[PDB]
């Protein structure tokens, strides 16, 4: 609609019609009137194309950004933090849209939580025990073992705890016995 208004503007002349200049004015003296009309429109065309090149860069930047999310969030699982939506992304569902695309991410965000006591290490017979990938928790006096996501207490055995020296090197290490399933198997 902006280019339509340029055809009606006189640009300092007496009329914006090309046929009107060659009717009321002689051709030998009409060269100074048509030149101002053409020059006034060339500045509008150069500005129009300049704006289209800038808007094309924003669309190109959005197309390259959406292409990475199409080959990672949809095709495969992206382990990045806050990339495929907002939370632990699992799978995506791309949907079509006029002059665009709509993404449907399925995140995994926990809900409520509780509070339990922990310990950096557990000392048994002078050997420091460390978890493999879990975290030592405790409800009452009992010391259990769970993962770092869902609350699933288990029994602290020898398969989840490994020795790594003595107990006089860990600052703030507690003292608690460790159940050994190998002993009842030999009895």
């Amino acid at each position: 609609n902006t280019l339509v208004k340029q055809l009606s503007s006189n640009f300092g002349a007496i009329s914006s019609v090309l046929n009107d200049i060659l009717s009321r004015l002689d051709p030998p003296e009409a060269e100074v009137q048509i030149d101002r009309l053409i020059t006034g429109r060339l500045q509008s065309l150069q500005t129009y194309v300049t704006q289209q090149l800038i808007r094309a860069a924003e669309i190109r930047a959005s197309a390259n950004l959406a292409a990475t999310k199409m080959s990672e969030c949809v095709l495969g699982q992206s382990k990045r933090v806050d990339f495929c939506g907002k939370g632990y992304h699992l799978m995506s569902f791309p949907q079509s849209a006029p002059h665009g695309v709509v993404f449907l991410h399925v995140t995994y965000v926990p809900a409520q939580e509780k509070n339990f006591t922990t310990a950096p290490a557990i000392c048994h017979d002078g050997k420091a025990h460390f978890p493999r990938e879990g975290v030592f928790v405790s409800n009452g006096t009992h010391w259990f073992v769970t993962q770092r996501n869902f609350y699933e207490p288990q029994i602290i055995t020898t398969d989840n705890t490994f020795v790594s020296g003595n107990c006089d090197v860990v600052i703030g290490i507690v003292n608690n016995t460790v159940y050994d399933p190998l002993q009842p198997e030999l009895d």
Binding site: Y48, R55, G100, T107, A111
Partner: protein
């Protein structure tokens, strides 16, 4: 940029028609200098300071860790453009019409329209 009932003089401007209160609410209409305006409580246009969020703190401990017990499933929606419309502009039709001398002067600027 005017030096200054319900007159409020801030670092961004001068608003006449909104009473400033000591309470802080959520932002809505941005004005400047971290001051927003909204239609809240009779109810009229009042001025206040925008709220940056609910101030809270986490009790730091040395022998306690929070373990989540319940998990939920949330689905989000994002909008990203892909393409737009395509147009075309020609010098022989937009600049000149059904004339003859108009196309003669355009030949001198043929490199621009090309």
């Amino acid at each position: 940029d005017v030096n200054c009932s319900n007159v409020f003089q801030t670092r961004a401007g001068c608003l006449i028609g909104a009473e400033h209160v000591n309470n802080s609410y959520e932002c809505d209409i941005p004005i400047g200098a971290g001051i927003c305006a909204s239609y809240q409580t009779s109810q009229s246009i009042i001025a206040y300071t925008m709220s940056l969020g609910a101030e809270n703190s986490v009790a730091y401990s040395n022998n306690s860790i929070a373990i989540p017990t319940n998990f939920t499933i949330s689905v989000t929606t994002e909008i990203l453009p892909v393409s737009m419309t395509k147009t075309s502009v020609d010098c022989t039709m937009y600049i000149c019409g059904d004339s003859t001398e108009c196309s003669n002067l355009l030949l001198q600027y043929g490199s621009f329209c090309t």
